[PDB]
Amino acid sequence: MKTIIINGVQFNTDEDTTILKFARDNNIDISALCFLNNCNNDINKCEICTVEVEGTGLVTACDTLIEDGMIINTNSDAVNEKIKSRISQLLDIHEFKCGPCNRRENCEFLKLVIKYKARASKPFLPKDKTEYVDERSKSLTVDRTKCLLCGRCVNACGKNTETYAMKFLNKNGKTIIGAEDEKCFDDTNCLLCGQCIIACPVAALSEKSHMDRVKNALNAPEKHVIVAMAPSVRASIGELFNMGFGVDVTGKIYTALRQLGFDKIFDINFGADMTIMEEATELVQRIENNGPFPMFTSCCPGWVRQAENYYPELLNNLSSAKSPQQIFGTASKTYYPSISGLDPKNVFTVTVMPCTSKKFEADRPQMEKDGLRDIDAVITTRELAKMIKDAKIPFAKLEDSEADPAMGEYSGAGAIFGATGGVMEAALRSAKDFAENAELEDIEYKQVRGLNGIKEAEVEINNNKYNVAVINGASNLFKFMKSGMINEKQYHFIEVMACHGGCVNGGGQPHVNPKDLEKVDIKKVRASVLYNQDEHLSKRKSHENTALVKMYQNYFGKPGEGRAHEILHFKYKK
Ligand code: HC1
Ligand code: SF4
Ligand code: SF4
Ligand code: SF4
Ligand code: SF4
Ligand code: FES
């Protein structure tokens, strides 16, 4: 037993944890900034977590272990003067103009400035902001006028992906963060997954904006603007409207999008059922052809970049089905004109994604046919939240509406796509029906669900056993390969997601305060919205989606053949 006194209050504890962890568990206030993902800024620690341990002096609570007989003061004058000084030094390298800033309503640094009444010794007012901003990437942007050099992005990149594509750099004698050799991130091994943005306390890292594309399209009278959101958006945008976590706001998003002036409200979960139509068909074909095995999913652009940059020999093993976003986009410029009379040229398709890598995918040169882009604009969950707020839409009090059904209906298989294992389960529900020409009632594949780094399961399909694997996060893909786990058995189908937890924890998602992250399992609570929708949907197999069956019946023909093979596919050769 340990006896520790914190602010004159006696505590007896069995545990071996840090002063910060103990404080956060016992309602004692200690501020923190550089500590995230169980690591602080080792080199150049922020010291916002300073507490006083009588006898030792000022220590950083985020990495100092509680000890028997320890007497801590978290709020003495010397502690507060030290913390206020460190925030003041950060204010000296921070362009403190919150009014137009994209983190204005949820900035961790603004909260610390208010809390300690910190003031810069000299206001940082850079005249030329172009020497601090890098907007060269199709997915990420850097604004160094806001960077605290707290290292949270560098640690999050290393942990979540193990690429270390985000680095500390010495530009002209001074420390900055950026890509290798200060290149555009797109030209390096970076996966453009945006986990560095998610880890940033301030507006120093952002998504590459597609808001002007959307604004101009809605204002162009001859353009018919389609919008379709990703699985994960309905499970998370409510967080930015003070609704809490795990709230299903699908119906509110549909109404908000109509109020924003979009001409047709569709859903990328329709595109998810399309990807399963093509990919489950392709899996049954590889089974019949005795290979090539394994087949990997090709729907995560972060993973496609990881395969192109680190494992190019695996590219021919990736599924030729386009991702839900791109397969939806292809059909929006071809099928959707045939059932509406719209000129293909006038259809402008916008998606809402939990992801920054999806902007890169949408802008890949060959993701078009006959000069028409599959996808014209991709805005993140955060960008749509700002669009709703700028338009003064009372999101939390909106009435529910439904999507327009032709490319808006989705099955429960499409609904779970945003969670790790979702694509795998959805694909198996169709591939087993397809391969043994039946309609099976047992459709839940709980063995591929959950937050484990690497998951596997043996599935019997048409009286033969097959091995599937789900790789949860880019660092776990590297582990799977480098450890030789890939060679313990013959894998036949492997799902790979670059973000830990799947797309519900994507790089374009709502930022979450580090205090709420320790209290709430964000990956499980966001994913639960999607599994609950599946549980309550009438159709739970992709091939039973009524709107999709008539789309293939009337326009595409059979999946994986003819017109479907001809335009709904994409294969990478580098
Ligand atoms: O971003 C992201 Fe995702 O694996 C999510 O949510 S799940 Fe997807 O196949 C695609 O495209 C689908 O459907 S990638 C998204 O929209
Ligand atoms: S990053 Fe935070 S403190 Fe800095 S200008 Fe933006 S809102 Fe204000
Ligand atoms: S986008 Fe992903 S891979 Fe690139 S620097 Fe950020 S965390 Fe690292
Ligand atoms: S970009 Fe953000 S997370 Fe990275 S060092 Fe700067 S303030 Fe910290
Ligand atoms: S896991 Fe989803 S959010 Fe993350 S990079 Fe892949 S597609 Fe984007
Ligand atoms: S939060 Fe402890 S040194 Fe930064």
* DSSP codes joined into one string, 91-118: HTTS----TT-TTTTS-HHHHHHHHHT-
Q: Tell me if 263 sits within 8 A of 225, measured CB to CB.
A: yes
- Looking up tokens 């990437």 gives 137
Read off the DSSP letter of residue 231: G
- Count: domains in the chain: 3
Pair of tokens at residue 412: 């429960």
Domain end call among 124, 146, 169: 124
User: Is the domain of 286 the same as that of 394?
Assistant: yes
Residue of 499, 509, 522, 523 best suited for mutating to test ligand 5, as the one with most atoms within 8 Å of CB: 499
CA distance 177 to 143: 10
Which residue lies with its CA nearest to atom 6 of ligand 5?
300
Do β-strands 464-472 and 372-373 pair in parallel, antiparallel, or remain unpaired?
A: unpaired
Q: Map residue 514 onto helix, strand or coil.
A: helix
Read off the DSSP letter of residue 398: P
Q: Tell me if 151 sits within 8 A of 168, measured CB to CB.
A: yes
Read off the DSSP letter of residue 510: P
CATH number of 13's domain: 3.10.20.740
- What residues form DSSP beta bridges with 379? 352
Q: Name the closest ligand to CA 151.
A: 4
394 Cα to the center of ligand 5, angstroms: 29
Residues in the ligand 5 pocket, defined by CB under 6 Å: 193, 300-302, 354-355, 357-358, 497-499, 502-503, 506-507
User: Is the domain of 57 the same as that of 133?
Assistant: no
User: Is the domain of 113 the same as that of 254?
Assistant: no
Q: Looking at the domain assignment, is residue 574 inside a domain?
A: no
User: Is the domain of 112 the same as that of 198?
Assistant: no
User: Is the domain of 192 the same as that of 215?
Assistant: no
Do β-strands 347-353 and 224-229 pair in parallel, antiparallel, or remain unpaired?
A: parallel
Residues in the ligand 2 pocket, defined by CB under 6 Å: 94, 96-98, 101, 103-104, 107, 109-110, 146, 202-203
Q: Looking at the domain assignment, is residue 215 inside a domain?
A: yes
Q: Tell me if 399 sits within 8 A of 541, measured CB to CB.
A: no
Q: Looking at the domain assignment, is residue 392 inside a domain?
A: yes
Pair of tokens at residue 304: 């496609």
For the four alpha carbons of 322, 326, 327 and 333, in that order, the dihedral sign comes to negative
User: Is the domain of 285 the same as that of 306?
Assistant: yes
| E strands present in 249-402 | 264-267, 295-296, 347-353, 368-369, 372-373, 377-380
User: Is the domain of 440 the same as that of 314?
Assistant: yes
Domain end call among 108, 124, 140: 124
User: Is the domain of 561 the same as that of 471?
Assistant: yes
List strands edge to edge, sheet with 454-461.
Answer: 295-296, 493-497, 464-472, 454-461
Domain enclosing residue 27, as ranges: 1-124
CA distance 273 to 278: 9
For the four alpha carbons of 40, 42, 43 and 44, in that order, the dihedral sign comes to positive
Q: What residue type is 335 in one-letter code?
A: Y
CA distance 224 to 409: 20
The coordinates were experimentally obtained by X-ray
Residue of 229, 299, 409 best suited for mutating to test ligand 1, as the one with most atoms within 8 Å of CB: 299
CA distance 390 to 519: 30
For the four alpha carbons of 471, 473, 476 and 477, in that order, the dihedral sign comes to positive
With 0-12 CB in 10 A as exposed, 13-18 as middle and 19+ as buried, what is 365?
A: exposed
Cβ of 148 closer than 6 Å to ligand 4, yes or no, is yes
CA distance 269 to 409: 8
Q: Kindly give the interhelix angle for 381-390 and 211-219, rounded to the nearest 10 degrees.
A: 50
Q: Tell me if 255 sits within 8 A of 401, measured CB to CB.
A: yes
Enclosing H/E stretch for 12: strand 9-13
* SS3 per residue for 151-216: CHHHHHHHHHCCCCCCEEEEECCEEEEECHHHCCHHHCCCCCCCHHHHCCCCCCEEECCCHHHHHH
Q: State the CB neighbour count (10 A cutoff) for residue 515.
A: 11
Residue of 107, 145, 146, 152 best suited for mutating to test ligand 4, as the one with most atoms within 8 Å of CB: 152
- Ramachandran angles phi, psi of 474, nearest 5°: -65, -35
User: Is the domain of 482 the same as that of 512?
Assistant: yes
Q: State the CB neighbour count (10 A cutoff) for residue 461.
A: 20
Do β-strands 372-373 and 377-380 pair in parallel, antiparallel, or remain unpaired?
A: unpaired
Q: Map residue 276 onto helix, strand or coil.
A: helix
Nearest to 496 by CA among 294, 281, 316: 294
Pair of tokens at residue 8: 């004159």
Nearest to 157 by CA among 146, 148, 165, 169: 165
Nearest to 497 by CA among 487, 509, 485, 505: 505
- What residues form DSSP beta bridges with 142? 134, 205
User: Is the domain of 516 the same as that of 560?
Assistant: yes
For the four alpha carbons of 103, 380, 356 and 226, in that order, the dihedral sign comes to negative
Q: Is-cis flag, bond preceding 123, omega within 30?
A: no
Contacts 24+ apart (CB under 8 A), 393-397: 393/256, 393/259, 393/260, 395/238, 395/241, 395/249, 395/252, 395/256, 396/238, 396/241, 396/242, 396/243, 396/252
CA distance 186 to 137: 6
CA distance 27 to 36: 19
Cβ of 287 closer than 6 Å to ligand 4, yes or no, is no
User: Is the domain of 160 the same as that of 300?
Assistant: no
Contacts of 36 (CB under 8 A, 6+ apart): 152, 155, 156, 199, 514
Q: Map residue 133 onto helix, strand or coil.
A: strand
Domain end call among 100, 124, 148: 124
User: Is the domain of 272 the same as that of 385?
Assistant: yes
Pair of tokens at residue 124: 């940082």
CA distance 151 to 156: 9
Nearest to 198 by CA among 468, 567, 542, 501: 501
What b/e string do you get for 432-460 counting C-beta neighbours within 10 Å, with b at 16 or more? bbbbeeeeeeebebebbbbbeebbbbebe
With 0-12 CB in 10 A as exposed, 13-18 as middle and 19+ as buried, what is 293?
A: middle
Q: Looking at the domain assignment, is residue 513 inside a domain?
A: yes
CA distance 406 to 339: 9
With 0-12 CB in 10 A as exposed, 13-18 as middle and 19+ as buried, what is 525?
A: middle
CA distance 524 to 519: 12
CATH number of 180's domain: 3.30.70.20
